[PDB]
């Protein structure tokens, strides 16, 4: 038998990956200097440099995972890989929209919003109950030392649960690229005025 990838997903072009990575680093520098963040440093961990705090960063180019397959060992991996839309789309370019950036004490990431065509590539957990399909879609930008990058999607889902119910509060800041919200418990969300568009190739990563 042939094995499957470690995971499928959208892998950004170098130019797009560079643009988004730089936007994430600027956000981290801006957020860490904001009075509202500094005041709540107790709920999070002299000043903290968030670039340092998020000291594990993706090597190479950034990506947005669809289905983790573990070469076929993960539940649902074979069903996912055999879909016509997955086979037809393999190697094809797509444009992903980034609508928000977020930081928690564990991860820093970018929220991805998918087109209908891209949702067809999203696979069919309790953390996401009552949210739209594809809510977990994200690009990991940084993790704290003891954190695994899969936490980024769980962090996003938790943020979205508060946003859904209107608990994001009034905006606590305007940054150059959008509106900043303090969600409590170390969680911060920058809702971008203009969605960022990044070009990516849907393919499989093998390690």
């Amino acid at each position, epitope marked *: 038998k042939d094995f499957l990838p470690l995971y499928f997903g959208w892998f950004l072009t170098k130019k797009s990956s560079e643009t988004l990575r730089k936007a994430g680093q600027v956000f981290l520098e801006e957020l860490g200097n904001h009075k509202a963040f500094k005041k709540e440093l107790r709920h999070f961990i002299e000043k903290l440099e968030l670039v340092s705090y998020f000291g594990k960063r993706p090597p190479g180019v950034l990506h947005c995972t669809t289905k983790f397959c573990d070469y076929g060992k993960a539940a649902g991996a074979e069903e996912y890989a055999q879909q016509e839309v997955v086979k037809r789309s393999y190697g094809k370019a797509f444009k992903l929209s980034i609508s928000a950036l977020f930081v928690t004490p564990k991860t820093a990431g970018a929220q991805v919003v998918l087109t209908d065509q891209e949702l067809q590539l999203w696979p069919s957990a309790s953390a996401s109950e009552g949210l*739209p399909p594809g809510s977990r879609a994200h690009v990991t930008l940084g993790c704290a030392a003891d954190v695994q990058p899969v936490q980024t999607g769980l962090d996003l889902l938790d943020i979205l649960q508060q946003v*859904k119910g209107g608990s994001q509060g009034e905006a606590v800041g305007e940054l150059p690229r959008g509106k900043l919200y303090s969600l409590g418990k170390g969680r911060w969300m920058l809702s971008l005025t203009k969605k960022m568009e990044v070009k990516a190739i849907f393919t499989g990563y093998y390690g």
Partner: nanobody
Amino acid sequence: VQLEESGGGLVQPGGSLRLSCAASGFTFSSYVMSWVRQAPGKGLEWVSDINSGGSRTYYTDSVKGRFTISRDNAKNTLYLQMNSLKPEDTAVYYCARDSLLSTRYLHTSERGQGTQVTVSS
């Protein structure tokens, strides 16, 4: 980008309203469209959204089975049929461009002026 809501009003619990939102200034048939609402003393919260062709809809668990979102792309109009209304449904309702997940509705330029819905005796 223009969004004009209408259809709000006062109703008794169990009653019905239909909100409308006429869109202009963009290619309406290209966009997911959303309804959000803000109850007194609370933040803007999700209600429902609908994809461009109208084939996919989303509802928060709190309105599921009672509200129906729909659209008429030829008339560039979005609708929210609100049945079996409860006092908990009292709020200002806003139509917004793009999906709920996109949080476009958090930006003033992306939403309409809002329409009052009040449910009591």
